[PDB]
Amino acid sequence: RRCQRCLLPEKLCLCSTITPAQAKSRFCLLMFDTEPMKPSNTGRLIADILPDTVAFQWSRTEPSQDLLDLVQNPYYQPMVVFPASYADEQREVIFTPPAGKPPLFIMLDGTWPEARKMFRKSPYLDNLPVISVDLSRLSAYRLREQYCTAEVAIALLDMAGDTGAAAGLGEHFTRFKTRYLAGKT
Amino acid sequence: RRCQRCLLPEKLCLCSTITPAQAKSRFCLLMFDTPMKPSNTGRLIADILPDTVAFQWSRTEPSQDLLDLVQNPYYQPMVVFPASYADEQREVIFTPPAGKPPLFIMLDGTWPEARKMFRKSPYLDNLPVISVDLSRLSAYRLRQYCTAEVAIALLDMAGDTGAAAGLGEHFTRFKTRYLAGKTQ
Ligand SMILES: C[S@@+](CC[C@H](N)C(=O)[O-])C[C@H]1O[C@@H](n2cnc3c(N)ncnc32)[C@H](O)[C@@H]1O
Ligand SMILES: C[S@@+](CC[C@H](N)C(=O)[O-])C[C@H]1O[C@@H](n2cnc3c(N)ncnc32)[C@H](O)[C@@H]1O
Ligand SMILES: [Zn+2]
Ligand SMILES: [Zn+2]
Fold this sequence. Notes:
The structure is a homodimer.
Chain A: E1 26-31, H1 43-49, E2 54-57, H2 65-71, E3 77-81, E4 93-94, E5 103-109, H3 112-120, E6 130-131, H4 149-159, H5 163-183
Parallel strand pairs in A: 1-2, 1-5, 3-5, 3-6, 4-6
Helix pairs in contact in A: 1-5, 4-5
The complex binds S-adenosylmethionine (SAM) (2 copies) and zinc ion (2 copies).
Residues 3, 5-6, 13-15 of chain A line the site of one zinc ion (ZN).
């Protein structure tokens, strides 16, 4: 009764509406559980609009070597997307994607206690900059300026100059949330 | 808090999504009254087919513009109502005839309102009643049926598949946002 690709009740299936976009930015979803994707999980909306998004199962002791190879690939400028109130005094915090190299935005995908734990117990992320997100930019896409993973990504895409992809994901996100609420009725 | 044109909350306003279509068929909305409730679906027809006409129904004095339209021999006018209500002598058809463009007269009200309109309208009595083949909704992945759903099936019955599909997609979009607005 639910479509397996978009996870909505089959009558509200939005798969035919999906139009991918292009962006200089790249996302990496670091997932706490990778359990059978819950419909309310907005992180997966990002990969619908930006199919080059990567996702990794998080692991406290044995991090995947694909993940290590990505976050260490000097082609990207990687950053950890998490609220700056969590970072320690010595941690570099930035407020803009830096200039020059394409950003790799590392999103901590889980509940808040799970994402906090991921933030504190992942040594391969510890020397990366934290990007504090400018959520006021959601207004330019007519979204309410915590915030879910797809809303942060929209702000990040806008912060990087990727306005086509930001608008694309905003429309996709709104479309999902509307149909999700409808199928709840 | 509600958009005045599409009647949904401003956050869910669909007005920018509306793409009008063209059709050989034409609709005439007969309304027991005209503020409108958001749940009324007859207004959706006009969004997709902007040549739709609507008239406020009256028992005593029908407006002359409505009398002029329904007697205009350019059209083949039809009263859209379930055939189980028609008189033994009432011409009932199951297909829009061919040749002259159809003019589909929809009785837009509640079922008690639509029935009184059907029975107490002398200017509609010589017109044929078209019984609607609702199974055609399957071709548009749809499905008492509401006004806009009956209009989709009539459009498909007439060969107006582009506008049938346009109205189906507009109808689903409104119904989804309407439901989402009831939640949250
Ligand atoms: C805790 S998860 C919540 C997941 C949500 N249930 C969903 O739809 O996927 C939200 C993640 O988005 C990012 N995020 C949320 N709010 C943020 C903020 N204010 N500043 C920086 N990143 C934020 C962080 O990566 C955070 O871990
Ligand atoms: C009773 S109104 C429903 C009003 C509803 N609140 C709305 O706005 O959609 C439905 C109208 O569509 C047409 N209709 C509905 N079901 C029909 C059927 N089975 N056969 C022929 N016409 C039908 C008739 O004109 C009827 O008056
Ligand atoms: Zn789907
Ligand atoms: Zn509107």
